[PDB]
Amino acid sequence: MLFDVIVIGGSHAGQSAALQIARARRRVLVIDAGARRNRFASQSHGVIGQDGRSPDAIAADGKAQLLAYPNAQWREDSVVRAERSGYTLICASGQHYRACQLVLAFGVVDELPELEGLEERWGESVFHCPYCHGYELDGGRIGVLGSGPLSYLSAMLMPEWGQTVFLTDASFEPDEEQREALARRGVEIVRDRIARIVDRATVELADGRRIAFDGLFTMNRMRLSSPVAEQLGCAIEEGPLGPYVRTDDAMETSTPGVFACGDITHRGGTVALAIGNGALAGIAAHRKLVFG
Amino acid sequence: TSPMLFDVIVIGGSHAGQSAALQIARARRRVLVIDAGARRNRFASQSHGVIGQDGRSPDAIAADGKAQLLAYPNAQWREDSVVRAERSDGYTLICASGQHYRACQLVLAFGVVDELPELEGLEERWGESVFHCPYCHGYELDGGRIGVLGSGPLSYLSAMLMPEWGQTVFLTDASFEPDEEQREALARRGVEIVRDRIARIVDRATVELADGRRIAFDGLFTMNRMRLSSPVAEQLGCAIEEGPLGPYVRTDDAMETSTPGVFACGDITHRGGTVALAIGNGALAGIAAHRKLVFG
């Protein structure tokens, strides 16, 4: 099957891109594996129009609106191989598809420290993004898990949402500079080894003592969901927390005819930005179909 | 009356301003939106191209967003127009009502105003059968007949694009004359050129030419000029640059203008023209404005 564009990933970025291509009366296929990065929280925040709505509902509304266009197609599957040919995609199911252009919108995967109790609380009481989930902590106690330079900056912003403690876990020991800057912002440093997280977000130390937090934040590392960008030769840069696919102003990668949007690009990390640069990418892809 | 000091005031309360204000509200800071109630998109019955809001009424989109923002008790709204902005030892905004408001930082989100050509009947049909943006309204023309009202060199590229959505006539109207490469290009794309002067637009979408001929269209497009809705950006000393279709307020990667503590978002910035873009860079502006409150 030949399409004008195939969009790999059918969450916020992919749907936004696909909608532009559909509205341009071109034949577009979304191939989506169905595991969004935000499948862990009960509510989304920060997107005007969708504030406080469930992520499942946001994603379903968008799928419904895209598929109102009969020239848009959907397939629940995973792309395992992409190659120049236009482009040919091979899916985990064994199905092959072809397209003149591609839009990469497959997202990133969060990689968490190996701390007993932490991962089961992801999106419930342990978070990455204070604009996304800080407000609902209601000014209570917040723990920031230390893990390098960006943790220190996060801890310095976090007092906006509640009383903040920087937790070193007996590993990430701040230097003189970092240390003095925390003390001025009123951020306590706790250096004890953490054995596990219990209850809502209570840190239990190796010596048994507990520190009860209302929420924990981590500036955790992220990986690309798929090797498809690397297969296609798309330039990938290494950010402080993980890789992203390079793009220009029109969201085009270093590989002509392959565009990228959402969390896999440099300005990502939120739904608002996924929607915005997804739309840029979809319009750009269409413009390249017409003018080259 | 009791004194108020807002961490941020957002001037303009449509897509861009609401998106910015929401970030600030979620950062537990005090935010005021002052909005004059005249969105650029107050003429069309449906909005398109924003995933989640595709095909919904602009009025409903605006109302839903306003209600969501005002659910935060640290967010406030005023239906007013800022007539003057000045720097003090933060910022003071003077409104048409005579009310004054005080802010530490500002987000400009006041949009642009479409400057339509003086063609009889065109303004009456703006947002009904006459449009600016083909991604916004091309699809609903259903492969119909489309007229591209000539406005100069930029109308040529529009005419070359429009066959994606329907059978296209380039109404050059003495504003443009294709050379040879361009006439061949239009011809290869299946675009008809009509050179006679346009007298009038009548009925729903019929072009009435100087010689008396009538051409019925299903929709018309104009690559019209736009101006900033307010002099507030200039009052604040914000650098303004001339774009191909009108001026924009200059912004850096953090959506900050040349004036520290004044940010901008939406159609008044270099990348605009759509709601999706307004929401995206409004969110950038709100987060950036918050970050400056904390770190300077």
Ligand SMILES: Cc1cc2nc3c(=O)[nH]c(=O)nc-3n(C[C@H](O)[C@H](O)[C@H](O)COP(=O)(O)OP(=O)(O)OC[C@H]3O[C@@H](n4cnc5c(N)ncnc54)[C@H](O)[C@@H]3O)c2cc1C
């Ligand atoms: C716990 C948590 C809470 C969050 N809360 C918020 C919030 O409140 N507000 C906010 O703005 N942001 C929030 N975020 C960030 C937000 O989730 C992302 O910014 C957003 O989901 C990015 O959208 P995306 O389309 O780029 O990728 P994703 O939403 O991750 O979607 C990627 C899609 O591509 C698919 N895919 C992956 N590989 C393949 C393949 N090989 N073939 C086909 N399909 C594939 C996946 O299955 C998935 O469906 C949160 C993140 C987390 C972790």
Ligand SMILES: Cc1cc2nc3c(=O)[nH]c(=O)nc-3n(C[C@H](O)[C@H](O)[C@H](O)COP(=O)(O)OP(=O)(O)OC[C@H]3O[C@@H](n4cnc5c(N)ncnc54)[C@H](O)[C@@H]3O)c2cc1C
């Ligand atoms: C007919 C038409 C149809 C369109 N359809 C679509 C579409 O379907 N999809 C799409 O994505 N885009 C569409 N657009 C483009 C879209 O309207 C804009 O991109 C978008 O509205 C810009 O958002 P904004 O918040 O920057 O500005 P606006 O939506 O214009 O809002 C600016 C607000 O600021 C207020 N304001 C102005 N001056 C002051 C002041 N001095 N003090 C206080 N408040 C002030 C105004 O009253 C207004 O409420 C359309 C445009 C037009 C003209």
Ligand SMILES: [Cl-]
């Ligand atoms: Cl998060």
Ligand SMILES: [Cl-]
């Ligand atoms: Cl790249």
Ligand SMILES: [Cl-]
């Ligand atoms: Cl970058």
Ligand SMILES: [Cl-]
């Ligand atoms: Cl005051």
Ligand SMILES: [Cl-]
């Ligand atoms: Cl404060």
Ligand SMILES: [Cl-]
């Ligand atoms: Cl328009």
Ligand code: NA
């Ligand atoms: Na949201």
Ligand code: NA
């Ligand atoms: Na992601």
Ligand code: NA
């Ligand atoms: Na994103």
Ligand code: NA
């Ligand atoms: Na609109």
Ligand code: NA
């Ligand atoms: Na409302």
Ligand code: NA
């Ligand atoms: Na003409």
Ligand code: NA
């Ligand atoms: Na805009």
